[PDB]
Amino acid sequence: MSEESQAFQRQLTALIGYDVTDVSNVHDDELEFTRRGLVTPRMAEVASRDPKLYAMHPWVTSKPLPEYLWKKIANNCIFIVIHRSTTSQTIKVSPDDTPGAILQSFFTKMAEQDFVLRVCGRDEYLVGETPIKNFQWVRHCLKNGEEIHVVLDTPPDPALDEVRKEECDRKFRVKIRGIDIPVLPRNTDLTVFVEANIQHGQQVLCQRRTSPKPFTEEVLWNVWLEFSIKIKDLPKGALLNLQIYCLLYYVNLLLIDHRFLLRRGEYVLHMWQISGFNADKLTSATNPDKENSMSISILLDNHPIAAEMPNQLRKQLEAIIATDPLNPLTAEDKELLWHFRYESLKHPKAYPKLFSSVKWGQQEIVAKTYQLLARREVWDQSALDVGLTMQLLDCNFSDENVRAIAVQKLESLEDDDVLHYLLQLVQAVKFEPYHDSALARFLLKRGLRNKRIGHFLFWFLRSEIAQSRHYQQRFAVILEAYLRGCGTAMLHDFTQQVQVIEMLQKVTLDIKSLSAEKYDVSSQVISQLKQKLENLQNSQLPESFRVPYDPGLKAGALAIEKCKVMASKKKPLWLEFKCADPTALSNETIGIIFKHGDDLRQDMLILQILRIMESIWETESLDLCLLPYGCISTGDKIGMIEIVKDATTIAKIQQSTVGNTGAFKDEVLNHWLKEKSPTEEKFQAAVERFVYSCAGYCVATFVLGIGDRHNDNIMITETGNLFHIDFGHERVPFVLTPDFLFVMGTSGKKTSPHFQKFQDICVKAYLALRHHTNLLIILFSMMLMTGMPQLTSKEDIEYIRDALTVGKNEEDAKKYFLDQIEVCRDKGWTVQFNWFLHLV
Ligand SMILES: CN(C)c1nc2ccccc2n1-c1nc(N2CCOCC2)c2nc(CN3CCC(C(C)(C)O)CC3)n(C)c2n1
Numbered sequence: 127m128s129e130e131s132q133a134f135q136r137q138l139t140a141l142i143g144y145d146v147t148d149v150s151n152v153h154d155d156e157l158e159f160t161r162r163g164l165v166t167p168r169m170a171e172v173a174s175r176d177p178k179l180y181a182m183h184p185w186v187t188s189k190p191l192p193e194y195l196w197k198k199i200a201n202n203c204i205f206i207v208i209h210r211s212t213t214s215q216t217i218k219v220s221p222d223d224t225p226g227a228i229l230q231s232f233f234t235k236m237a238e239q240d241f242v243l244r245v246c247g248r249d250e251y252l253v254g255e256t257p258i259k260n261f262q263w264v265r266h267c268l269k270n271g272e273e274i275h276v277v278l279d280t281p282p283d284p285a286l287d288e289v290r291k292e293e294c295d296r297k298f299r300v301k302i303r304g305i306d307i308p309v310l311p312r313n314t315d316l317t318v319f320v321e322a323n324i325q326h327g328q329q330v331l332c333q334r335r336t337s338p339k340p341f342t343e344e345v346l347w348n349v350w351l352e353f354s355i356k357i358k359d360l361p362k363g364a365l366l367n368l369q370i371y372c373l374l375y376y377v378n379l380l381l382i383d384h385r386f387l388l389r390r391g392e393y394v395l396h397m398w399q400i401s402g403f404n405a406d407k408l409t410s411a412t413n414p415d416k417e418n419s420m421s422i423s424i425l426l427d428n429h430p431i432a433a434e435m436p437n438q439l440r441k442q443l444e445a446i447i448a449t450d451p452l453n454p455l456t457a458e459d460k461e462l463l464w465h466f467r468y469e470s471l472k473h474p475k476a477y478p479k480l481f482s483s484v485k486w487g488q489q490e491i492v493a494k495t496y497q498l499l500a501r502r503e504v505w506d507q508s509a510l511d512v513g514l515t516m517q518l519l520d521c522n523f524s525d526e527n528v529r530a531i532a533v534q535k536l537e538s539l540e541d542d543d544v545l546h547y548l549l550q551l552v553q554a555v556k557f558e559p560y561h562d563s564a565l566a567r568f569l570l571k572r573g574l575r576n577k578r579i580g581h582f583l584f585w586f587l588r589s590e591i592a593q594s595r596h597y598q599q600r601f602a603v604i605l606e607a608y609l610r611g612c613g614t615a616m617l618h619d620f621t622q623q624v625q626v627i628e629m630l631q632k633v634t635l636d637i638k639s640l641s642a643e644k645y646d647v648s649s650q651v652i653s654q655l656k657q658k659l660e661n662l663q664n665s666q667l668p669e670s671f672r673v674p675y676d677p678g679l680k681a682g683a684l685a686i687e688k689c690k691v692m693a694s695k696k697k698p699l700w701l702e703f704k705c706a707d708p709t710a711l712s713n714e715t716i717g718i719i720f721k722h723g724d725d726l727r728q729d730m731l732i733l734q735i736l737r738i739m740e741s742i743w744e745t746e747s748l749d750l751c752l753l754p755y756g757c758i759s760t761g762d763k764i765g766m767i768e769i770v771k772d773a774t775t776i777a778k779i780q781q782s783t784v785g786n787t788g789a790f791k792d793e794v795l796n797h798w799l800k801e802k803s804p805t806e807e808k809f810q811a812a813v814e815r816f817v818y819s820c821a822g823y824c825v826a827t828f829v830l831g832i833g834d835r836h837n838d839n840i841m842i843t844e845t846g847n848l849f850h851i852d853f854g855h856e857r858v859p860f861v862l863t864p865d866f867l868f869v870m871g872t873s874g875k876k877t878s879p880h881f882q883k884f885q886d887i888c889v890k891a892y893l894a895l896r897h898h899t900n901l902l903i904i905l906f907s908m909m910l911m912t913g914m915p916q917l918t919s920k921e922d923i924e925y926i927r928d929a930l931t932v933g934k935n936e937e938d939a940k941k942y943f944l945d946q947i948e949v950c951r952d953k954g955w956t957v958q959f960n961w962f963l964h965l966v
Pocket residue numbers: 692694696698719721729755757767768769770771773774775778841851852853
């Protein structure tokens with residue numbers, strides 16, 4: 127290859143954080159096959175993208191303006207402040223006017239046609255034929271009561287986005303030779319056997335075990351395990367799952383490879399150890415630590431191509447379909463869906479149940495299933511249902527044709543909605559049997575098609591590549607595919623970002639292992655901090671970089687005087703940058719907190735579900751005033767977090783008035799709000815914001831089953847906006863403490879106008895969510911699988927069914943939630959006080 131060609135690939139590696147030309151852990155060529163296979167989709171999308179629009183990446187939505195944002199326009203007139211040449215002028219614009227038309231009524235109001243409208247201080251643009259009201263930035267301004275400020279400048283040059291050119295009827299059987307681990311303690315004596323499963327979509331087709339034996343550094347069987355199922359009957363994407371029990375180790379092996387070939391030969395598989403069920407148990411990858419890991423040795427020696435329902439049965443069938451996603455299917459249930467297959471096809475909500483009713487261990491039956499998909503008319507014409515689509519992409523479906531129809535239905539998503547679900551789609555890639563998938567190809571295209579999506583795709587993929595041995599190989603290949611298509615402008619941006627984040631990660635760890643647990647910091651700890659940051663500033667760190675959680679904002683130089691270390695346990699950095707954009711309205715800095723560590727992946731998963739819950743309320747015209755702060759995971763137990771300005775912790779508001787207890791005063795919160803309000807009109811508005819945002823997080827947390835939290839984890843702004851934080855960690859349903867209630871004008875057993883408004887808001891919010899029950903359930907279950915440790919599929923998930931009061935009616939549901947509120951009144955400060963004792 128060329129001298130430049132190798133330096134480029136070395137640049138890719140630095141961005142990816144994994145070398146995809148490095149073949150150290152693989153038993154086949156699938157990863158290299160997939161690199162080639164992604165070239166066409168990549169190239170297809172680069173070719174179809176408009177250079178101008180790709181360069182300006184307008185952030186837009188086809189959804190209608192909510193009632194709460196219509197009420198903020200009372201004259202049918204929106205005001206845009208344009209800035210040019212040190213002179214600024216307000217202008218009256220109609221909500222239906224396009225950017226090109228308002229620019230028209232600009233040059234008119236004077237008494238050359240190549241200027242674009244950019245937001246001041248941000249990398250946002252208003253352009254294309256869209257109504258100004260359909261621009262996100264505009265809607266964001268109307269919601270927070272912000273004036274819309276826009277500067278007139280030159281469109282960014284599409285030249286900068288340029289892309290470099292490309293250069294048997296036999297029963298299946300497996301011999302278990304044995305298992306070898308380099309070392310073991312002595313011991314104590316225990317017993318070990320091997321369990322071989324044939325798995326397709328977590329359904330077990332066949333199972334065979336070995337005879338238990340004494341656990342020693344090498345254990346031999348050399349026995350053939352003959353299964354019932356025939357070689358010809360193996361479905362594509364079926365896993366041979368090998369597990370050792372005493373459950374200690376597991377490893378997976380794809381039985382049919384990426385070329386449709388049956389797997390054959392000797393295999394020495396290095397397995398994964400269980401930590402003293404989860405998407406990591408599905409992985410076809412083998413443990414990269416080849417020296418210290420348990421391994422299993424097996425042998426494979428053994429090609430594909432190439433009447434109306436009666437009424438009472440119809441009701442049982444419909445009852446099946448009505449149930450939630452995670453309700454289990456009996457055998458009779460399954461046989462009903464399968465026999466009545468043609469009826470089931472007329473009910474898009476039955477697709478997940480019907481496809482779990484397929485016997486995938488039988489080739490004739492799989493064959494029928496494909497014929498069934500052949501007439502897709504009803505599925506193709508149906509309204510897009512995201513939660514339904516999401517069910518076909520989870521761990522219960524390994525068939526590429528089933529999964530592909532889900533992806534077909536994704537194709538109709540506007541960028542706005544792809545952002546909403548991006549994180550969850552990226553995680554779903556883990557459930558893909560093969561590295562090259564319709565879903566993987568769909569993430570590629572959407573990312574290549576739009577810079578905002580592309581930006582987040584990059585960080586989502588990079589997070590997993592950095593902390594996951596299970597999926598990093600497959601993600602790294604998809605990221606490389608993305609990077610070769612995004613343009614050199616974006617390659618440059620990413621390169622600037624990565625250099626900064628890694629340097630600051632180095633520092634984050636270097637301070638953390640200069641410090642202990644308060645006690646505590648410490649002038650010395652803060653001196654070493656500034657010292658290290660001084661060495662980076664000069665020299666050398668990048669002049670500027672995009673903020674990974676807010677790609678609109680460009681960060682400038684550190685402000686080293688305001689940087690510091692946080693008094694907490696984990697000793698996170700508090701960093702502040704100047705904004706690099708000189709057209710920015712204010713002088714405010716950009717705060718960022720670097721933390722090691724909790725798991726910031728759990729925070730990302732929750733914040734995303736939180737933004738989903740918001741959009742659900744937006745369709746019903748509800749505004750619960752949530753605050754999903756930017757949070758990105760960088761590496762194992764490490765990442766960045768957006769600093770929310772003028773915000774404090776509820777705990778810190780109690781210890782200002784009181785000290786290092788623990789003795790919680792009811793009036794404190796309300797005094798803090800009043801003290802922090804410049805006028806009384808802003809304090810009333812703040813009490814209003816706190817009623818909605820409190821109602822918002824009570825309902826949201828109760829459903830996600832995270833409702834029981836310490837006051838250190840809750841925050842509030844000076845404008846009254848309450849928000850939960852740190853999601854990577856007697857009882858209570860959620861947190862409504864006497865101090866929250868006091869702000870609502872309630873001391874226990876007393877109702878008030880603000881507290882009645884609260885209950886009313888909670889119920890409306892809660893009942894709106896219940897209409898989305900399937901969606902929330904699938905999202906929730908996916909989060910557990912992809913984001914938490916090994917959990918119980920059966921009991922942990924079940925919480926949210928109770929939380930969402932499945933099967934009940936809006937009357938019982940309204941009662942149920944109201945009771946929960948009462949439970950919080952009766953507990954008062956008791957759970958809170960106990961949390962304080964558990965961290966003392
Ligand atoms: C462990 N802590 C640091 C933490 N983990 C988090 C995980 C996810 C999200 C947030 C997490 N925080 C977190 N995130 C804070 N963010 C500031 C407001 O946006 C959001 C970020 C935060 N803030 C305080 C208290 N805080 C009081 C005011 C102080 C100052 C006067 C300089 O403004 C500065 C220090 N704690 C204890 C905080 N923990």
